Amino acid sequence: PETRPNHTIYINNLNEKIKKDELKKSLHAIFSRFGQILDILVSRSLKMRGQAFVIFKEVSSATNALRSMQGFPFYDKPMRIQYAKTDSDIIAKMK
RNA sequence: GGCCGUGUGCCUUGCGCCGGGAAACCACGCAAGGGAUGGUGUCAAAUUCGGCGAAACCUAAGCGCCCGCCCGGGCGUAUGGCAACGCCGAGCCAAGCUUCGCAGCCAUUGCACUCCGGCUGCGAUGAAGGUGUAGAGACUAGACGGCACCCACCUAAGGCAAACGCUAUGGUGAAGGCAUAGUCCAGGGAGUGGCGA
RNA sequence: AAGCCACACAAACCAG
RNA sequence: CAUACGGCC
Ligand SMILES: [K+]
Ligand SMILES: [Mg+2]
Ligand SMILES: [Mg+2]
Ligand SMILES: [Mg+2]
Ligand SMILES: [Mg+2]
Ligand SMILES: [Mg+2]
Ligand SMILES: [Mg+2]
Ligand SMILES: [Mg+2]
Ligand SMILES: [Mg+2]
Ligand SMILES: [Mg+2]
Ligand SMILES: [Mg+2]
Ligand SMILES: [Mg+2]
Ligand SMILES: [Mg+2]
Ligand SMILES: [Mg+2]
């Protein structure tokens, strides 16, 4: 379902075969139509595989991303999005 | 093939010893013997270039002594040389391991911000051990070699235990592979030709 | 000298 | 005990 608003969004249920360095650019171009993107974290580890965190400059870029991109097929797989349960280390150094 | 001897590598015993180790025991220095040194699989590849050392042993230019002197000689000696062998820089290497890529399958629906699941497959780099290092050398093979286990003996740090204590990822079960076993091919056996003293 | 290098070469044997 | 060296068979 949904959680409570955040600067960063939690993306899961991805295709686990797409490589780290390739996927970043496939995310930096597709989501930049909501606003500016700060950083995209992707790990291929057993725990973090098929998961991605996308950090925007403002909430407006992330809130619309939750609605406009909910269910979008990405490499023949549905894209599930939730709000982040924590604030990113990239964000914590400013506030 | 045997018997005596010298050297060097070896192990055992009985000595020394601010080294490492928790102990076993390893390493170090020497001296006297040859009684002893467990097992099964696996790996067979690279085998290039270039420097550093050696004992006995063989020989005697130079130099020393001597045959009173020269002419010959004689005696000592390595600094010359053979060579068991001890090793250094660079390049390459099989399987087993450290770490990385890509592919393949099995898992995994997982909230991270430091990196990270397991296999089998090539390719890659790490640390061993090789190789260079045979009588110039060519080639087969397993071993005394690299590797995983297996067994006997010793110790027990850590882990286990209330506890006498249990337990090996720690020791001990030699060195030989500067060619070991083989089959070749140098070499001597057995010729002249230089160089050398 | 001991030994080294080049060419030539018959055996069993010795042969790292 | 192994390698190599000096003798001897
Ligand atoms: K000690
Ligand atoms: Mg014996
Ligand atoms: Mg070959
Ligand atoms: Mg003289
Ligand atoms: Mg004279
Ligand atoms: Mg003499
Ligand atoms: Mg000498
Ligand atoms: Mg050499
Ligand atoms: Mg060789
Ligand atoms: Mg060898
Ligand atoms: Mg041989
Ligand atoms: Mg001859
Ligand atoms: Mg030899
Ligand atoms: Mg030998």
GROMACS .gro file of N, CA, C and O (backbone and C1' of nucleotides) in nm, chain B residues 1-2 4-5 7 9 84-85 175, chain D:
model
  124
   96G      O5'    1   7.475  -5.154  -0.871
   96G      C5'    2   7.395  -5.237  -0.791
   96G      C4'    3   7.476  -5.353  -0.734
   96G      C3'    4   7.564  -5.313  -0.617
   96G      O3'    5   7.500  -5.302  -0.493
   96G      C1'    6   7.690  -5.442  -0.767
   97G        P    7   7.558  -5.202  -0.383
   97G      O5'    8   7.681  -5.281  -0.318
   97G      C5'    9   7.661  -5.406  -0.253
   97G      C4'   10   7.795  -5.473  -0.228
   97G      C3'   11   7.887  -5.397  -0.134
   97G      O3'   12   7.845  -5.407   0.000
   97G      C1'   13   8.013  -5.467  -0.314
   99C        P   14   8.228  -5.092   0.468
   99C      O5'   15   8.371  -5.022   0.451
   99C      C5'   16   8.443  -4.977   0.565
   99C      C4'   17   8.587  -4.944   0.531
   99C      C3'   18   8.619  -4.794   0.526
   99C      O3'   19   8.631  -4.735   0.655
   99C      C1'   20   8.697  -4.887   0.331
  100G        P   21   8.524  -4.623   0.696
  100G      O5'   22   8.578  -4.489   0.626
  100G      C5'   23   8.700  -4.429   0.668
  100G      C4'   24   8.773  -4.364   0.552
  100G      C3'   25   8.731  -4.221   0.521
  100G      O3'   26   8.782  -4.129   0.616
  100G      C1'   27   8.754  -4.338   0.321
  102G        P   28   8.568  -3.472   0.642
  102G      O5'   29   8.455  -3.397   0.557
  102G      C5'   30   8.489  -3.274   0.500
  102G      C4'   31   8.418  -3.260   0.368
  102G      C3'   32   8.273  -3.218   0.379
  102G      O3'   33   8.260  -3.084   0.431
  102G      C1'   34   8.300  -3.371   0.205
  104G        P   35   7.590  -2.896   0.544
  104G      O5'   36   7.455  -2.965   0.494
  104G      C5'   37   7.372  -2.900   0.397
  104G      C4'   38   7.265  -2.991   0.339
  104G      C3'   39   7.175  -3.065   0.438
  104G      O3'   40   7.073  -2.985   0.497
  104G      C1'   41   7.254  -3.222   0.292
  179A        P   42   7.713  -3.079  -0.930
  179A      O5'   43   7.702  -3.141  -0.783
  179A      C5'   44   7.697  -3.282  -0.771
  179A      C4'   45   7.698  -3.329  -0.627
  179A      C3'   46   7.588  -3.277  -0.536
  179A      O3'   47   7.471  -3.353  -0.553
  179A      C1'   48   7.793  -3.249  -0.428
  180C        P   49   7.347  -3.273  -0.613
  180C      O5'   50   7.290  -3.203  -0.481
  180C      C5'   51   7.264  -3.062  -0.477
  180C      C4'   52   7.338  -2.994  -0.364
  180C      C3'   53   7.285  -2.857  -0.322
  180C      O3'   54   7.178  -2.866  -0.229
  180C      C1'   55   7.511  -2.835  -0.369
  270A        P   56   6.176  -3.458   0.463
  270A      O5'   57   6.314  -3.442   0.385
  270A      C5'   58   6.397  -3.330   0.412
  270A      C4'   59   6.539  -3.355   0.367
  270A      C3'   60   6.554  -3.400   0.223
  270A      O3'   61   6.559  -3.287   0.137
  270A      C1'   62   6.674  -3.546   0.361
  309C      O5'   63   7.031  -4.670   0.681
  309C      C5'   64   7.085  -4.633   0.555
  309C      C4'   65   7.031  -4.497   0.515
  309C      C3'   66   7.085  -4.437   0.386
  309C      O3'   67   7.029  -4.498   0.271
  309C      C1'   68   7.063  -4.270   0.550
  310A        P   69   7.115  -4.508   0.136
  310A      O5'   70   7.109  -4.361   0.075
  310A      C5'   71   7.003  -4.326  -0.012
  310A      C4'   72   7.002  -4.177  -0.037
  310A      C3'   73   7.113  -4.123  -0.125
  310A      O3'   74   7.087  -4.143  -0.261
  310A      C1'   75   7.090  -3.984   0.060
  311U        P   76   7.208  -4.187  -0.357
  311U      O5'   77   7.269  -4.048  -0.408
  311U      C5'   78   7.186  -3.946  -0.463
  311U      C4'   79   7.231  -3.808  -0.416
  311U      C3'   80   7.335  -3.739  -0.505
  311U      O3'   81   7.286  -3.608  -0.540
  311U      C1'   82   7.416  -3.755  -0.279
  312A        P   83   7.424  -3.693  -0.874
  312A      O5'   84   7.557  -3.666  -0.787
  312A      C5'   85   7.680  -3.741  -0.800
  312A      C4'   86   7.792  -3.668  -0.725
  312A      C3'   87   7.937  -3.717  -0.725
  312A      O3'   88   8.013  -3.694  -0.845
  312A      C1'   89   7.881  -3.651  -0.508
  313C        P   90   8.144  -3.781  -0.883
  313C      O5'   91   8.257  -3.748  -0.773
  313C      C5'   92   8.335  -3.628  -0.780
  313C      C4'   93   8.427  -3.615  -0.659
  313C      C3'   94   8.536  -3.721  -0.646
  313C      O3'   95   8.649  -3.701  -0.733
  313C      C1'   96   8.428  -3.704  -0.441
  314G        P   97   8.727  -3.827  -0.796
  314G      O5'   98   8.803  -3.893  -0.672
  314G      C5'   99   8.923  -3.833  -0.623
  314G      C4'  100   8.985  -3.911  -0.508
  314G      C3'  101   9.017  -4.057  -0.534
  314G      O3'  102   9.132  -4.075  -0.616
  314G      C1'  103   8.922  -4.037  -0.323
  315G        P  104   9.141  -4.205  -0.709
  315G      O5'  105   9.127  -4.329  -0.608
  315G      C5'  106   9.226  -4.430  -0.605
  315G      C4'  107   9.236  -4.493  -0.468
  315G      C3'  108   9.202  -4.641  -0.466
  315G      O3'  109   9.307  -4.724  -0.518
  315G      C1'  110   9.081  -4.540  -0.298
  316C        P  111   9.279  -4.810  -0.651
  316C      O5'  112   9.302  -4.962  -0.604
  316C      C5'  113   9.331  -4.995  -0.468
  316C      C4'  114   9.224  -5.080  -0.402
  316C      C3'  115   9.152  -5.180  -0.491
  316C      O3'  116   9.234  -5.287  -0.533
  316C      C1'  117   8.996  -5.086  -0.348
  317C        P  118   9.207  -5.345  -0.680
  317C      O5'  119   9.076  -5.435  -0.661
  317C      C5'  120   9.085  -5.561  -0.592
  317C      C4'  121   8.948  -5.613  -0.552
  317C      C3'  122   8.875  -5.695  -0.658
  317C      O3'  123   8.905  -5.833  -0.642
  317C      C1'  124   8.728  -5.531  -0.560
   0.00000   0.00000   0.00000
